[PDB]
Design a protein around this ligand. Sequence first.
Ligand SMILES: [Ca+2]
Ligand code: NA
Length: 259
Amino acid sequence: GCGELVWVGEPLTLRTAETITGKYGVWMRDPKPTYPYTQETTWRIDTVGTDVRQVFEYDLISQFMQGYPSKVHILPRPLESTGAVVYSGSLYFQGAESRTVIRYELNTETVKAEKEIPGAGYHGQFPYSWGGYTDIDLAVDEAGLWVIYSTDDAKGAIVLSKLNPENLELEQTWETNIRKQSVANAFIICGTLYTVSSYTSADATVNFAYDTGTGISKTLTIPFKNRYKYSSMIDYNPLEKKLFAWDNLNMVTYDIKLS
Ligand SMILES: [Ca+2]
Ligand code: NA
């Protein structure tokens, strides 16, 4: 059910943060939901601040849009930036001021694993073009769990590693030829890395693709809008086959078309 990205639609705002604390952040659903969660369970993390620990959890989409949280997790570890994902019942996030990825089982609220991403730059070393301590960007696609980062050895270019979702061991690593700080964000669809770059605060384009299957790179032009002029997060959800983004207090989704 895969294919290559050929179109990104216009943003649909699902919810707007109540306070300036939610100016940027990350919101997520589980592409492989596990009991007691479902494909509707939605997690939200406002990442404005210096000690981010609160994760808001909504059982229903209707609730995410108009109601209150079902549960609020207080993370044991401090969370960094907006690269986190939820996958198979666990929140995967980066420890504040570290290159450590943490697996946090949501239903038991237990940390199942913590692992340094070998050689990965962190806390401002290899951020996306706009900064934001976005050095490390987790991703989920049709094949499982990934991490997007860079190293001194890769010369600041985007590196991507397939991760073991249980213990976070790196299974395979790819080195691209695109400077990570040259793009505003990135995501993976069907084993292909796509990067997004911004001409302005409101105008963006999917501008580059790297196929992990062939190691073949390619330049693209797939325009789309940052309606609210400050996009801090853009991820792909392989279940819904849509892009989830956070844009200036607004949690939005994008329709896409695959070949
Ligand atoms: Ca991303
Ligand atoms: Na991410």
